[PDB]
């Protein structure tokens, strides 16, 4: 017997809705038709802050969708808009799959427990940096983060990567967002021995970061910069520097691929699911409900273990947090004040494109990150036998006083 098992989604435009329905129709042929029926429902996301969600409950929850897909609004406005749905479905215990939400704001699964997305967050980009750090053998770096769940998460992830190694926490630097005056900290940064730098921030903040950094001549050769996708993009580039490593997520802009891929992957999660018994349909009707949906966590469990490595977006596997695993990034260079692909990163191993490496100062290769410090500031305490303290005799610093043995 075939029961159309509805699915639901929120997408940027009606064309993408048609793409969704098309992929769904392709879906019946791939998984067994007799066992289950697939039906597609979606919304074009008219921009109402608290009413789209109203309709999600009124229409989609009333339609008991077995799962929902979501994408970042086509209109280029707002940040992390898909907060409400994760809460709203949360009562429903209905799995949600995001296509375009690479933002780490919804990483907080203690309140975003029902939340998920195919793309890895900005924090996971650190996987690259550790591998990058691994190749070049610089164990000494500096980390500059904005102060928020995003930056702190990035720090936690990278440090966790380092934890397997002897923990490497030298020179972490936290600044708070929206701050135009940031030079003072960099003066502090010069002091530190390590010459390689990595940073995560928003585009607006990054302008201020580079603006302040250029004043103190931080960009000069013997210094290295590693950065997030957001940093290379936008206004960050214009008052922006040269020879700095950068990252861009593969197929990040285009959800449709992620739509077909996520749906194929979800299909494994639901079709396999029905192999199990004691299943319950998602709560039908928003009204009359206060209870969770017992199946939902199970649906999450299979869906996280869904496999489907072959895919339009690339290999698919999910980490413990529900974040995607081994997403491919394309390394970017600033050559001649323009973005170029020096190499591309896929899987656990980096790949080197034919293009010549660029660094600060123009050297083909710039491996050494330990110039070091000629002068050491030494500290002590006042302990009588091994240390003595006398005031400078007037201006003169010291006395010609002699040891018992004549010296």
């Amino acid at each position: 017997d075939p029961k159309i098992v509805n699915i639901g989604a929120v997408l940027s435009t009606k064309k993408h809705e048609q793409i969704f329905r098309e992929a769904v129709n392709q879906a019946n042929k791939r998984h067994f038709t007799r066992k289950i029926q697939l039906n597609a429902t979606s919304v074009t996301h008219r921009p109402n802050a608290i009413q789209m969600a109203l309709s999600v409950c009124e229409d989609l929850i009333s339609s008991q969708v077995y799962a929902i897909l979501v994408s970042h609004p086509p209109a280029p406005t707002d940040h992390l808009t898909p907060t409400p749905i994760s809460y709203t479905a949360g009562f429903y215990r209905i799995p949600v799959i995001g296509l375009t939400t690479r933002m780490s704001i919804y990483s907080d699964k203690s309140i975003h427990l029902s939340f998920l997305r195919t793309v890895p967050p900005y924090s996971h980009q650190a996987l690259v940096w550790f591998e990058m750090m691994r190749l070049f053998n610089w164990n000494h770096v500096i980390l500059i983060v904005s102060d928020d769940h995003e930056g702190r998460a990035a720090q936690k992830k990278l440090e966790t990567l380092l934890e397997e190694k002897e923990s490497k926490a030298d020179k972490v630097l936290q600044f708070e967002p929206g701050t135009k005056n940031l030079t003072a900290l960099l003066l502090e940064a010069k002091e530190l021995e390590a010459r390689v730098i990595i940073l995560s921030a928003s585009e607006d903040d990054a302008t201020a970061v580079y603006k302040s950094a250029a004043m103190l001549d931080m960009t000069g050769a013997g210094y290295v910069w590693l950065v997030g996708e957001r940093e290379i993009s936008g206004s960050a580039l214009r008052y922006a520097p040269d020879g700095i490593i950068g990252l861009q997520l593969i197929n990040g802009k285009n959800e449709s691929a992620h739509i077909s891929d996520a749906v194929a992957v979800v299909a494994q999660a639901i079709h396999e699911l029905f192999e199990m018994e004691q299943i319950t349909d998602p709560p039908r009707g928003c009204v009359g409900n206060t209870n969770i949906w017992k199946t939902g966590p199970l649906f999450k469990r299979v869906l996280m273990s869904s496999k489907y490595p072959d895919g339009v977006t690339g290999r698919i596997e999910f980490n413990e947090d529900g974040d995607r695993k081994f997403a491919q990034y394309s390394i970017m260079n600033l050559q001649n004040r323009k973005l170029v692909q020096v190499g591309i990163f896929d899987g656990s191993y980096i790949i080197q494109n034919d293009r010549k490496i660029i660094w600060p100062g123009g050297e083909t290769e710039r491996p050494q990150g330990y110039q070091m410090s000629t002068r050491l500031k030494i500290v002590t305490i006042h302990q009588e036998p091994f240390v003595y303290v006398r005031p400078t005799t007037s201006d003169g610093t010291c006395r010609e006083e002699y040891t018992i043995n004549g010296d």
Binding site: H382, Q383, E384, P385
Partner: protein, 51 residues
């Protein structure tokens, strides 16, 4: 002082830990002085500074 770690970790010495704590000093000059001043009957510190 590092011996405080010994008293800390030594639950066996908890009694002494507090007994000690309540009389502690910012420095050796005052700690030696108390015994010299006879304010405090006993002083505890590592030998190299003390001998």
């Amino acid at each position: 002082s590092s011996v405080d770690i010994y008293f800390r970790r030594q639950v066996e010495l908890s009694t002494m830990y507090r007994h000690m704590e309540k009389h502690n000093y910012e420095s050796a000059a005052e700690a030696i002085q108390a015994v010299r001043d006879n304010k405090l009957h006993a002083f505890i510190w590592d030998s190299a500074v003390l001998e």
